[PDB]
Amino acid sequence: MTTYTLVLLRHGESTWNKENKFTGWTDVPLSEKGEEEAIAAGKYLKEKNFKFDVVYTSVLKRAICTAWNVLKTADLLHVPVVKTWRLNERHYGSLQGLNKSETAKKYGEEQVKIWRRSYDIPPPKLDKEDNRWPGHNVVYKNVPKDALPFTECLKDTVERVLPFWFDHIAPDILANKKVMVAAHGNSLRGLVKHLDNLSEADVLELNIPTGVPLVYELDENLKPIKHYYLLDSEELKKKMD
Template identity: 40%
Template sequence: MTAMLALTQHRCNKVPIIIHDESEESKMWSQIHSEETKKQSIPVVKAWQLNERMYGELQGLNKQETAEKYGRHKVHEWRRSYGTCPPNGESLQMCSQRAVAYFRKHIEPQLFAGKHVLVAAHANSLRAIIMYLDKLTTQEVINLELSNGVPMLYIYKEGKFIRRGSPLGPTEAGVYAYTWDLALYRHKLDEMSN
């Protein structure tokens, strides 16, 4: 849903279309045959590999209920360690294996070909991809905080990924500072509010 909302507001004014690739039949059914339609649309690919980490027996419980049932220290360990799984759940390491494998197989080739890709996903799958891109340690990734709805921009240049913007704060200023159109837009907003 986040990707669809973002794309409907994108300056390209293209219609986001979900591409189904679960089976050969679904690929065939979601194929666009009209060249004119292809020019007016932008593909959206859903991938289960970018789903949120599976919390097993913690799934659906709020933090308070979970802490009361299992103890605050244990819940913190499950939520904030790299290799420890909650009961019948998935560790960040396991989530990272599937998310990064998907990124490397399906997204990197697009980037290497010079295409632009928007990745909208859940915090832990994004945290795993950021760990891979920024070469973070397991300790650095568990302390990485991501703000909801704040875009992060990566540029692939000279064989490496360079981050523009910061995941650390609730401000979008870091991203605005790196794109000319957005910087002008932000400047106009700042002038109007003063």
């Protein structure tokens, strides 16, 4: 008898995408193009008449600008925005800032694949005393420093995402408010893993395109009914890589 609507939105391209450095929690801005992706997304949302009561996002700039550009375009600047580290990209450990190929040559090309493409084998942990430690960064000034990863594997990311869904995202949906989550591909993958109740296998085969709204239709027990991408079926096919 009753249906809920949730919107997941990955962030568009960033400065590092055309550079091949591992990024993780490194705070890179959107690029000209990823700015265009969030306005467009917003434009589509407006045209199809999606309204929001809450927007949840990471504390990483590239997702915050995404949420913001959507709301501006859709004329919902008044909508409250909740930012949480719990929505961040998967942390890349000592790999952060480092060049993908130059690390495929300072280690096996099969080592970087496990670290990149597996589910539960994390890259080398950072030291606390390294300057990339999140705990040195004022962004996390107001968060117990022991909550912050030295390194993550997708399973760690999922585990730190799900509390935020049960405590905040999910009550909201259950309270009859329309929520959008503008986060990162890995954190959004933690979210669909649970929603679609995916095995380790399938969730690793799942690729979420950038800048494309993912609409989930959920029942009274928040189990999906269906899920669809809001795009024209010519950009979507292109956008699927």
